[PDB]
Design a protein around this ligand. Sequence first.
Ligand code: HEM
Ligand SMILES: [Ca+2]
Ligand SMILES: [Ca+2]
Length: 306
Amino acid sequence: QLTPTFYDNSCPNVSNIVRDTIVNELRSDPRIAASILRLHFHDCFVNGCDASILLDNTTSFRTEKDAFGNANSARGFPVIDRMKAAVESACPRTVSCADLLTIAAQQSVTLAGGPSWRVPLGRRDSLQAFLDLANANLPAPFFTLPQLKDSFRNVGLNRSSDLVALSGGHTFGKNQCRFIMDRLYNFSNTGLPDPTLNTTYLQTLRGLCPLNGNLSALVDFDLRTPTIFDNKYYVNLEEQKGLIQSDQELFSSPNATDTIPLVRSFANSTQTFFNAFVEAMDRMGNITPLTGTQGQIRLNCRVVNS
Ligand code: HEM
Ligand SMILES: [Ca+2]
Ligand SMILES: [Ca+2]
């Protein structure tokens, strides 16, 4: 089983090295904390948190970086390489890329103002990447609530609290116009905007993402505190200001009887949200890990050891 003390003897300073790397990167890229948390999420939803997402292409298997949910979206890979190299220098062949990314995600959340906790450790690295599985398992912004729930349950997270709390990751970070164009101009072939999108916010978003405009333009997930990890994300949902369809459905879907109370509870108390986020994060981080002698302690997160 995974344990927070896994490296307390072999690499006591791993968390500090990870933190230092992120602090340094944040000075030039304020979006990196968000990007790193998302990398961990996309790692865990595909064959578990096994650093499979970090692997590059080989002639035998395709990289998950070309999955619909990762291509021209997932970022921060060089930063992970940097901290990995630093950790390898401090403690040779000790910390797995899977664990490194987990610590990076937690440190990223804390650095952005979120809760601080010690993540369970002991994960090992995959011997292959899973592009098809990534295309099948990663949720999409156009998913209905039932589909979002299906996606989470498919990887092992049965609880609505898992879905609602982890969606809080959208309390910071960026989103491309491409993913909300339907909500803004033609939702579900209705020829009208998504009725669950606040009409005042609708105008603002249309200004940032005009029809036939730059689909790659970036918009903040959280209009209240774009780069701070806090519970404002849920306050937005209550006002119909969730940015993407999957955000707003947590509060407005006909199937949201179970998620609405969670959204309200997280909007009403930072402590309630933070506690639930840590609980959900550790649950996601416990998805089908390779442990013991399974897999490897990858030296270069981009390639399997040979
Ligand atoms: C519930 C289903 C989810 C869907 C459909 C979803 C969808 C997306 C989409 C469309 C983007 C924008 C990517 C881009 O424009 O390049 C994104 C970004 C992001 N997501 Fe989610 N997401 C989900 C859950 C989560 C979870 C569970 C976390 C982490 C706990 C997370 C963390 C993030 C972060 C922090 C970003 C910003 C990354 C950056 O700015 O580099 N997401 N997500
Ligand atoms: Ca994975
Ligand atoms: Ca925020």
